[PDB]
Design a protein around this ligand. Structure first.
Ligand SMILES: Nc1ncnc2c1ncn2[C@@H]1O[C@H](COP(=O)(O)OP(=O)(O)OP(=O)(O)O)[C@@H](O)[C@H]1O
Ligand SMILES: [Zn+2]
Lengths: 205, 436, 421
């Protein structure tokens, strides 16, 4: 995932309190724009373009009724065999603490993306960190889904000639404008799907 | 139309049509199946399918009902042909033993269908049924087939074509109503085609009846350059071959094309170009015994020959799907409980797409065999390479040597490995520069 | 004695029993047969795959080994029994001058019987089959298993049929397994329920090899399966499921009847032919069918035929016999392809092993990524090119993801050229 800044809460959530109000009592269209400004139109868990939009409670409503209307528990997920749907009815016996919440934890500290489209825990992870990354991989089905893997792999390999040729020009110029080129390349990927994998491809480390 | 039948009456309704700028005749009141519904049938509790009037491809894993659908359609179509042939034909019943969902408290099944027949008959509902008392609402089907039969009897009309080319395709014959002889039996009567062709040459209008099916063989089947008879001889792979000496699958595709051409050319005598006749054709495993070089041509050529015939097709070939528009694919969910009520088109456009893309995004299978340990080598090599600052190491060198030996020096995988080495080592040099 | 030459063996570290005097077809030659003027095939001991455009040549081949093995079969069954033979069923090459056709095959039966040359239409195969008959009469031996699975095994669902090991060979080379015979034999074993270990071994073979069927058993008499977690009947199974079931069950029955003395009857020596391994199989099962077979059928020399690249992704390039395109029957010898296929990309297999593109050239959809690349590199990175990229593109589709990357590379190369100047 990407790093996201938890946006200010929409005022529509203040009219509902857990217990006496069902989730369907909330107009979904009244809360979506804030999530859109949060995520830029991409899934919180797999960074795919959102077309089958789905408001997702990071901590499940059934097990966490008190957090049903809490603003920091809402994410705009896609969907289904991946992400939130796999989280509540595909996987099981997991603890929500082990999952990476991409609004208060840096994802790059745990998750590393290869050239081959696979996502593995980052180098040096031990103990709770590796367990965190493993459960984040499993529960959201970040690589076991064939569709997600395939799309991410084909996206990553699409820019590999560019990554090869950018660094080849290292000795061609003074490092200032080369750093400018690298920054410009890091700018575009922000508007594309799976931008964390593309950043892992482009970045120094 | 029904009111006119009770009252040029009903003949122009079936006979009127127009010719496209492409030269393909289009009937004004087109006939095809629109909506198909099953209840407590085999693997389905309830399921509804919407069909196009041009094409429908049904795909999925093993099982899943892709054939079932065709079997149920053919059983429904049997009531049309029976009452076209004779009044009170009584059609065919569902199997009381096999065509009911085993776990169903109703202990009975219904197969519901709706056949669009132009601006007059917007809906011709049909409901075949069976019980382990349940009856069938075949009355409007009987009515429409009776209109066809009676109108043809007073003045001949181009009757609809119905066929089911199942797995069984590979194991007086002069009267146009013989075209309906076991036409839903699961296999074309290729022997009857042989007899019909022999009779045609012995008589040798009938000449154009011969030439039309000959052109169908020559254009649709890629191998057959020419066909004639002494027993039948073919110009197969550039030299003369006997009919029984034809290749497997080559002969099967030949049998499909020839049988359909004969049936359709007998059923539609009044067409200027008979190939443009009405009808519904069901094909199971369209790719059967076909090399991929023929898989990427079979549907295109088949539909170029028979334009306005409504095709319902089952396939397992991602190469075939690469010639099909997104709206025409109908897929099942790979993980379903059987109560999945509908089924819909894919998300990606498959027409013109790469085989590797369709193989993974649509059919949901990895583009490389995950059970082959040699496919994972690039991933392990990449993980090892970055395990120490992205420069080459002895373990990484051993993996590089294994890749070089197994896949080859000119292999794409080795090019990926060496480009990975170059890029990561450079990255490490950039990190060293930034360190100071 | 001579029996020990057949019965001895050794077990691998994997647990697989290996016959030291392994019996397999080593070399095969066809003269004036079907389309071949003179053609030589060298066969692999483990597994061999023939690929090509038309089914005629590959069938021919498998038909030739089936008819050759028929003589072994007949002489195993009846003394001096005449097996199947050509004897001029229009198998002569259609323009051959010799009007004669010989299927020259050289079987290998270990260190001693290094060569057993047979030709049809001298037939010294009796000389070995007489050993296979006289031995197994004085004292039982594990006979070699033979089979052919043609298109005919997709059939819709007269002997003692049972308790006689020679109920095998009954119609094994006919092209279709006797699925009804298997059902009958299963019913009788279930009635009596060594029969128990035969039944359990067969059931384990079905469960392991076939993905869908998790369990199979017989009820009041009728046979039930647990297919896709549902308990249905044999005739309720799909055509693909039933075809795979019939093939695996028929081969397992024949081989468990032919090899009663093995600790695992599933690994006896033999030669099995399969004309269409991918018949009615979803690609998901195509990725697993050969691994499952080879894990369940260790020592058997599989000579199979396929048109499915997904199958070829699981085979080493040494096992392919490839009919190069434009291959007149005058070709002397079939040989392996250059590209290693095992574990390689599917598109690369398509492109270089079967010589057809990854994208169908029959349709363009009124645009084409290659045209965009050609125009972009011609202009070096603009209304016509943007019109091309606006055709259906402008979407996440890979067709746009590659185009935008090439636009970036072209503009970047232009910037490099500007800085260099
Ligand atoms: N009456 C029934 N009750 C319960 N399950 C049934 C019944 N009839 C069929 N089935 C189930 O439906 C399937 C029958 O095959 P199905 O028609 O779905 O496959 P298909 O279209 O022939 O596909 P393929 O040949 O590609 O596997 C099996 O999974 C079987 O268990
Ligand atoms: Zn997602």
């Amino acid at each position: 995932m990407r790093e996201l800044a938890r946006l200010e809460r929409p005022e529509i959530l203040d009219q509902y309190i857990a217990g006496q109000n069902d989730w369907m009592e909330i107009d979904q269209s009244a809360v979506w724009p804030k999530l859109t400004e949060m995520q830029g139109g991409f899934c919180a868990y797999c960074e795919c373009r959102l077309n089958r939009c789905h408001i997702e409670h990071f901590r499940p409503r059934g097990k966490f009724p008190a957090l049903t209307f809490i603003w920091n528990n809402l994410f705009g997920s896609c969907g289904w065999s991946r992400c939130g749907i796999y989280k509540d009815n595909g996987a099981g016996a997991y603890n929500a603490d082990d999952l990476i919440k991409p609004d208060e934890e840096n994802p790059d500290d745990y998750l590393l993306f290869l050239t081959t489209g696979e996502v593995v825990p980052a180098i040096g992870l031990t103990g709770r960190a590796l367990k965190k990354a493993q459960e984040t991989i499993r529960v959201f089905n970040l690589n076991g889904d064939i569709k997600l893997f395939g799309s991410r792999r084909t996206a990553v390999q699409a820019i590999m000639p560019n990554v090869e040729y950018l660094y080849t020009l290292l000795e061609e110029f003074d490092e200032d404008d080369w750093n400018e080129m690298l920054r410009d390349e890091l700018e575009k990927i922000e508007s594309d799907e799976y931008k964390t994998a593309l950043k892992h491809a482009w970045t120094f480390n | 139309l029904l009111s006119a039948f009770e009252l040029e009456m009903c003949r122009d309704y079936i006979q009127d049509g127009h010719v496209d700028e492409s030269g393909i005749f289009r009937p004004d009141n087109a006939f095809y199946l629109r909506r198909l519904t099953l209840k407590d049938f085999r693997r389905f509790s309830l399921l509804e399918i919407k069909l196009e009037e041009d094409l429908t491809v049904i795909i999925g894993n093993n099982g899943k009902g892709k054939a079932a659908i065709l079997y149920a359609i053919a059983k429904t179509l049997s009531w049309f042909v029976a009452n076209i042939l004779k009044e009170g034909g009584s059609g065919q019943r569902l199997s009381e033993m096999t065509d009911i969902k085993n776990d169903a408290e109703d202990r009975y099944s219904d197969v519901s269908s709706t056949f669009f027949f132009g601006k007059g008959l917007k809906s011709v509902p049909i409901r075949l049924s069976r019980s382990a008392r349940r009856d069938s609402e075949v009355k409007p089907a009987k009515d429409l087939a009776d209109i066809w039969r009676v109108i043809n009897e007073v003045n001949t009309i181009n009757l609809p074509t119905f066929a089911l080319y199942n797995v069984e395709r590979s194991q007086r014959r002069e009267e146009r109503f013989d075209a309906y002889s076991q036409t839903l039996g699961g296999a074309g009567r290729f022997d009857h085609f042989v007899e019909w062709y022999i009779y045609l040459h012995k008589r040798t209008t009938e000449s154009v009846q011969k030439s039309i099916v000959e052109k169908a063989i020559c254009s649709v089947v890629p191998s057959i350059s020419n066909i004639w008879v002494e027993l039948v001889k073919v110009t197969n792979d550039g030299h003369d071959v006997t009919i029984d000496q034809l290749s497997d699958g080559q002969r099967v595709f030949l049998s499909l094309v020839a049988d359909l051409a004969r049936r359709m050319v007998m059923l539609n005598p009044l067409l200027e170009n008979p190939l443009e006749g009405r009808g519904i054709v069901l094909i199971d495993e369209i790719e059967l015994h076909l090399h991929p070089k023929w898989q990427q041509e079979v549907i295109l050529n088949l539909r170029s020959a028979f334009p306005n015939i409504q095709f319902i097709i089952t396939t397992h070939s991602p190469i075939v799907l690469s010639t099909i528009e997104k709206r025409c694919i109908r897929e099942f969910e790979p993980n379903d409980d059987g109560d999945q009520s509908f089924l819909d088109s894919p998300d990606m456009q498959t027409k013109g797409s790469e085989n590797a893309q369709i193989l993974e995004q649509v059919m949901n299978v990895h583009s490389t065999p995950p059970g082959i340990a040699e496919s994972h080598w690039l991933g392990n090599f990449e993980l090892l390479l970055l395990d120490n600052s992205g420069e080459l190491d002895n373990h990484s060198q051993v993996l590089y040597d294994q890749i070089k030996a197994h896949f080859g020096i000119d292999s794409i995988e080795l090019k990926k490995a060496d480009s990975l080495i170059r890029i990561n080592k450079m990255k490490n040099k950039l990190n060293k520069i930034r360190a100071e």
